[PDB]
Structure formats: C-alpha cells, structure tokens
Amino acid sequence: AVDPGPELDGGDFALPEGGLDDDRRLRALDAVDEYLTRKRKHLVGYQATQDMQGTALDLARFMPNNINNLGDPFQSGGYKPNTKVVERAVLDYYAKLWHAERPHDPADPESYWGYMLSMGSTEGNMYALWNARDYLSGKALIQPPRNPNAHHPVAFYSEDTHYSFAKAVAVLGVETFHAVGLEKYADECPLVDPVTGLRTWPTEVPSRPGPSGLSWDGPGEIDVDALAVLVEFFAAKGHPVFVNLNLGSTFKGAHDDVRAVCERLLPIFERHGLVQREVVYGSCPQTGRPLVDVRRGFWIHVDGALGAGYAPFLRLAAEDPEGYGWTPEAELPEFDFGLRLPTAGHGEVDMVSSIAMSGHKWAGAPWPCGIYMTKVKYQISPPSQPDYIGAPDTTFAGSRNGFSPLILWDHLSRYSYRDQVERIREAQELAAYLERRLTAMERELGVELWPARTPGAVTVRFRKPSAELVAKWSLSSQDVLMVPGDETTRRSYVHVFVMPSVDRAKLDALLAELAEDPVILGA
Amino acid sequence: ELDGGDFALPEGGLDDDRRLRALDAVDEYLTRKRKHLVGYQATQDMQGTALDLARFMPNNINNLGDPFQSGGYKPNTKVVERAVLDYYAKLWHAERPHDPADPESYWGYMLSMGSTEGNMYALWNARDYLSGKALIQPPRNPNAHHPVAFYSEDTHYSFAKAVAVLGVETFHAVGLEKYADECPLVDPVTGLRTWPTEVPSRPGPSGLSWDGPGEIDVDALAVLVEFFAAKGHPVFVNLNLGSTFKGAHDDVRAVCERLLPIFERHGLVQREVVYGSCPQTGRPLVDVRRGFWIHVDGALGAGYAPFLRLAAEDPEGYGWTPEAELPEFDFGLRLPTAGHGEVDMVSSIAMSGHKWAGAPWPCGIYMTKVKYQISPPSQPDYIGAPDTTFAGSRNGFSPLILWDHLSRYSYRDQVERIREAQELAAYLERRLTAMERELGVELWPARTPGAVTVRFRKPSAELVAKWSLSSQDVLMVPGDETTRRSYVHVFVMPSVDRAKLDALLAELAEDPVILGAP
C-alpha cells in the first residue's frame, strides 16, 4: 500500500533547560511545516476546509499582537488591543444570513445576541445548553434598560448527534430523556425497540431507518415521529424541553428537518402549556413568596457547526435557481431565526432559540473558532460582574480569541453571496461524482465498497481501506453494528468530506489509490 | 477608534482596496494600543514568534483528542504539544513521562480558551472525582458525595462562572442552605456569624481585605475547611498563584501544611467511594480516593514562579536574591503524614500562555495526574483519540507559539525576565510615592511583596484608555456605597521596560484627575 510519509519525531522537539540554538529551532519548525504541508494537501476525511493561502498572506501581519476580545462583543472594555468592531461585523453578516433581527439592541428582546467562540462549536453547544438549562429552569435573565417537573428540563437529540452534547450534558447536569426515563418513568417508554420489540428507553432519539430497517444505514436525520412521541411524553409530565437538531451531522453530513420538527412540536408545546408560562425565579426580595416572569418552556438549538456555514447559500439557490444557474438536487430544510409558525392562541411563534457554527469547518481557519447566536430575550444574568475587564462577562470563555474575527472577516469579505453559492454547488456536485465513481469501481473491480451518501450531504461513506491509506488522506473512521447489541455484525466505514478545498483532481487521486488498496482488493 | 462603517460586510463582498484600508485601520489601532498596554497581565512583545510562525497560517491545524494519542486528523501538532507539556511538567516537578499505567505520572493538555478552560476543567475533574464518578480505564456519611468549594475573595471570576456551569456548591451556598446558624467565623465589620461569600483574604491597614495583600487568610480557610470536613463533605480548594488584581500569591505550602492534619483527622486522605452498583446484585462498586482536591490557578504565576524560586534556591549562581519569597506550589510539594508516609498535596494547575509568555490568542495548560483522570463522557470513533479534554477540536497553533518561545530562552534567561519585572515593579512603586511627595497628591500606591503589579488611584479616562489600564472599584467598608474608591493597576510584564514606565509616569504627573485629587 501507499506511503503516508514520516511522522514528527519527539527527539527533535525536546526542550532542554538551556534552550535550543537557531539551527535546531529552524530544523524542527521546518520538519513541522513539511509534515503539516503534506497532510493538509491530502486531507479529505474531515469537515475542515484546508485552503486559506490568501488569509495567511493578508493576516500574518497581526501575529505580533496579543489580541484579546475579553468580555461581551458589544462593548470594547479595558483591554484595548481587541477586534470587537470586526467581531461585530462578522456577527452582523451571519445574523443577516440566518434571518435574525439586527442590529443587536439590548432594549429589543427580539434582536440577536451572539459572540465568537475561542474553542470550536463545542463551546457553542456548551453555551447553548447552559443558556437553555438556566432559561428553562427559571434562573434570572439579563437586565432590561400543580407541576413538580416545571424546573426539570429534559434534553432530546438524535443518535447522529456529535459527542460534544454527551460532554455538555455531563458538564452542565442536564438530564437526557433517556436518563429521566430510566429514573422516573422506567416502564413507560412510548416507543418499541425495532430489534427486540421491548419498550426499552433508547439512549438517543432514533434516527431514520435505512434499507436494513435500522438506523445504521439510514440517512442520519432525526426520526420526527419518534421525537414527537418522546417530547409529548415528557411535556405531558410537565417537563420543559431542550431539543438539539443537527444541521450537517458529524458522520453522515445529514440535515435534521428543522421546519418539520418545529411544525410537529409546536402543537405539543401549545397543548401542554410550554409556549408561554409563568416561572418563579427565586424567592421574593423580603417576605417568603416567589418572583415571576413569563418564558417559553422549550428551547430548540441548531448545531450548525458545519451546515450553518453553507445551508443559507444552498437555500438561496433553491429560491432562485435560474438566477444562480443551479437547482440543488436536495432540499435543505428551513432552520434559522426566520422560521415562524402559527398557533391556535398565541400568534406567530419564532421557533429557533440558538444556532452554533464552526469557522474552521466550512470557511476554514488555522485554529478552532465559530459563532454562538441567540436572541436578547434569552440572555441569562452573568455569573458575576468583573470590574477589571470593563465589559460584561456574558460568554463561556473569559479571554477570547480576537484573531478569529479577523480570519472570518477576511474570508467573508472576499466572496459575494453568488461566490458562496458556487462553493456549495461545486461541493454538492463533487460529492455526487464521488459516489458515482465508487459504484463504478465496484463494477470494474468486483469489490464491495458499501458507498452511501445522504441526499444533500457533502460527505460520502464507504468501506475502510488499509491503515496506511487512511493515514495518508486523514480519513475519519466510524464502526457501526449492523444489529445493535451484536459485535459480530461490525462494519468499519470511512468518509470523505467534500469541502471547498477538495477538487476533482484530489478525489481522482484518492480513487486511483483506493482501486489498488490491499484491504479494498483482498476482501 | 475603529469605525464600524469600514468593516460592514456587504452581500457582494468588498474589493481589494476597501479590504486593505480596513485591515490597515485595524493594524494601526492595534499597534498603537499594543505599544502602550501596561494595565493587563498580558505580554505584548513576542520578539519574533510572528516572524518564525506566520508560515503556519495556511494550515487548518487541529489537535482533536488526547495529546498522547494518535487520531485521524493528521494535520496536528501533538508531537509539539507533548514537548511543551513535558517542559512545564519538569518545571512544576510533575512525574514524567506521561504514562497511563503510572498513576503518579502527569496528564495534561493545551487549552483552546485561556485559563478559564483550565479552571473549568479542574472543577469538572474535581467534582466528578470527589463525587464518586468512574475513573479512567488503565491499560454513616450522607455528605460523602457532596463536594464543597473554597477560594479567596481575590479569586478570578472564572470560578464563579465555573461553579454555576458545573453545579458545584461553594461553602457559602452550603453554609446558608444546610448550616445557616453555624458559621465558625465572625464578620469583622458587623461582628455577626454570617457566612462570608468567599474565604477571607488577609487584612490591610484598614483591618479589612480591600487594602490587604490579596492572599488568602490561611487561618480562616482552615477553620472553614475543618467545619465542612467534620460534617463529612469532600473539599475542593482553589489557590491563586498571581491573583488577577493584586498579583498576590496564596501561600500554597502554608495552606497544605495547615490542611493536611484536618484531612487526616476527618478521613479525607484515603477513603472508600461508591461509583456504581454491581451488574447483577446492585452492591456498591468501590475504590479508594482522596477526599480533597487542591487546584492552583497559576494563569499568570505558574509561568514565572518556578524561575523566581530557582533563583531563591541559588541566589549567588543566578546573581539575584529575590526580595520576596514565593511559596512552594507545585506537584513536588509533598508532606509527611502522621504515620511518616508522604502525601503529594496539589492535584492540578492551570496556566495561561497569553499571560507571562505572550501569545496572539488565548491558550494555556491544564495539568493533573493520571490517578485523577475521569472516564471520558463518551467513546468517539470519528476522532480516533479519546475525548478526554474540555474542548473538542483543539488549537494546535498554540503549541507552536509556546514551543517557539520556550526554545529561545534558557532557565537563566527566564530568571532574568522575572528579575527585571520584579525590579521594575519595585521601581514603579518608588516613583509613585516620590510623585505623591513632589506634587502633594494622594495616589494610594500599593504593591504586594513579590507581585509584578502595582495599584494606584484611577487617573483620567484618556490616560486609562491610552495605556489600557485595568480598573477596579472597592468599597472601603463592605456594603456602604459612599466608601467607593476607584483603582487601576499596572502589570510589569516582560514587554514593559523602564522607558515605558517613565513615559507613563510623566503623563500621570500632569494628569487632571491626579492633579485634581481631593
């Protein structure tokens, strides 16, 4: 099989007490560059854009600055070397793209609020679930200028949800429907397990079945029917509800049908008094009663780590296909802050409470970054009031990366909407091309590759090749059990993500190597 | 200031001329501010890190997963990351190499946020360890599972945030809820036994903490810890090694010496913990853990304190006797037990790379030991490496920044950097008091011995904005809004030299608020 090339050797990097001379330092940095350069040119297995030569030329000049966007993006604060003016421009652009109300205005509850992340979307998902936990549990909101389960939120998300949510749930102590089901409602699961036929609580909301009848070969989209049954169960018990929906899922690149979910859940929320409800937020200032305000009892979060970066552009083309000269083959669901639905008796309800996106995914960046966005009306009173930063502590991070706003600003400034439509068009068409070539390879060589692509996704999955090929092309791997609870049914998959830095020549080079790979051939 | 109009991003994009004009405006703004920043604990001169490392900006580097495991995302710098972690492990007297089979060996990782991530991780780790959640895979008492957090009034706001995020209760919350009338401390202002909101810091000339050094009151800590330990609670203590406003160093060694006998008396050195019930008959599955966790928030100080203590150990060899003693604080701090065994006292340390070293963005280190590692929240296929960190994707450019920094300086050069900063902080304090005598104004200058920050009366807004002076208000008698005083501080980082201080002092001497001072 192929050569992935040398790894870095730890001996070259050991840092002695006396320091390293300039020659040893440069040799080491050159080894890093040679390694990273070879790997970045061949990476096709992760949802991370690899080409930003232009941003490097333009933004290298900023590396001498210790930039810190400490505090809320909407006030400078005392740390003057900051890029909050740039950060606000990037936030504004995405607020427009996601049909949020702009400008940000602390006096307008419907207006957007958001900030740029210093980790990746893990930060945005953690923040979302923190914000939701406190909002749904009755903690105090930010300053303007009988039911025992009312304060016990329950989280719902599909089996294709990223591991950051399992992490966030544990960090924040938000209980999933699975945990609450087992603890409080052990024999009352409303779903029958398709393998066993028993009413056992599933660990996550089922995703849609594939040809097998099971989720492993399905599209990776949440089963809306299953979600609605589960949400109804807990809403009827009096619990407020947190739902995460994946817009570009980690392995399959699937898009949960956010509009279908919202249409199906709104009447459930209305029936069970979760559209508008009174909430006690601590005891009353002196005498032993409570205070009360009015809140919704549900929170829909869209994990658009990947997909919030391209879905607006695909949807633009879908709305005017002759203008963009492209009809996307798959429909991507309405998902953003513009999604508004009628009710029986509360008027139009704006359905989505928050969105996360990663900048190092579709746009590309040299480090993790991204955006969390919500609305003013959801903002929680900050944990404390630090004088020393001069700006409110409204964010998950303390010190914040102020170079990432420059990265994304530079990116966004170089492309029109039409250019952004072209980038998602080419990726969609090249993903379809890859799937076609993989099935043609199965016919030419008489090998099984198990190729699969969810319509509208920018990723294609297929049988895992040799370890050396996986290492050369940074293929991401996932094992599946074709029948849950049986380790004899394991299949090993990889996938390829067709990002804007992946072109036809790169895919053709990979395909030529797959065709001669010893695992692929010697099956 | 920067004009928002220059930065609005149109649907159609910006042309190359508008783009460059905007980027030039940003550079001009940042350059002017960087050169005058003296009010925050952030090194502003990286002395060629940018020359050396700009070349890496074309790479989407991702150190996804554990630093000590291969993963599938091959454009990563984990080899570099491990070199950096190894350097700090040695500096902090941790056991190396990292080895999952050696419980005493270090484990740590590089942060993608700043020290906020490391403080959050430490409290998460401690919460789960002290509460009996399952530990990582190697190759009676109703309060036993209810940890209680303690830290001083000079603790950074990231802890208040972390406590809220993680649902860890502070001694104040638990005191109020469970033990409302049993506070063992008397309030120095009121004389009532009201639970204070944080562990008292040491008093100043006022008899109150506001003009004190900013170090935790070890007596008060010990009284509080004993109270909750005696009730059966396990205990988390955060100690500040270079506090945010006063740059104080909690006496970590004194704290550990005072707490160990308390832990031994109340069975917190080695205790049985229930971490489940057995798969058939639900009998408690059990291992032995400690019932306390001491974290050092070295966001700032973990970067310089080793080097000062190196000089203190050999002052004639380094040609410098530090004037203040910085406490032993690290993984090497080991105390005798009642039975003449030894206990390694500190469980974790956090440090920020954008503070003492300098970086273009927030970064840092969290470090603990293998014996404390918690079982990951889930098992992910698609990353390869275990999900053992707070971040998911991780900044792999920061390891390059710190490696490059550390590679350029010997231990002796690092000792010189902290020497120069200590001497310049002492100079600043002398010049401020000389200014009070020359101009006949009261500047309230204050510097905790051994700190690299000096606090003084807040000057005009204009000067504050020019020099990025950090501000803090204090009430000189807690609860009385008429006793408010506004301070600023200057942090003498390695990028602050005599000339910069002298220029600031010349402006302060003509400042309207300083000259107009009642």
Ligand SMILES: CSCCC/N=C/c1c(COP(=O)(O)O)cnc(C)c1O
């Ligand atoms: C940049 S490629 C390696 C990361 C893969 N996925 C991350 C990922 C994440 C967490 O984002 P981060 O790693 O913290 O930037 C969240 N949600 C979804 C749907 C994802 O797919």
Ligand SMILES: CSCCC/N=C/c1c(COP(=O)(O)O)cnc(C)c1O
């Ligand atoms: C870099 S100067 C602005 C940050 C000031 N203080 C941060 C700070 C932090 C939180 O670190 P970060 O902001 O997340 O990097 C924690 N602990 C202590 C003792 C601190 O002083």
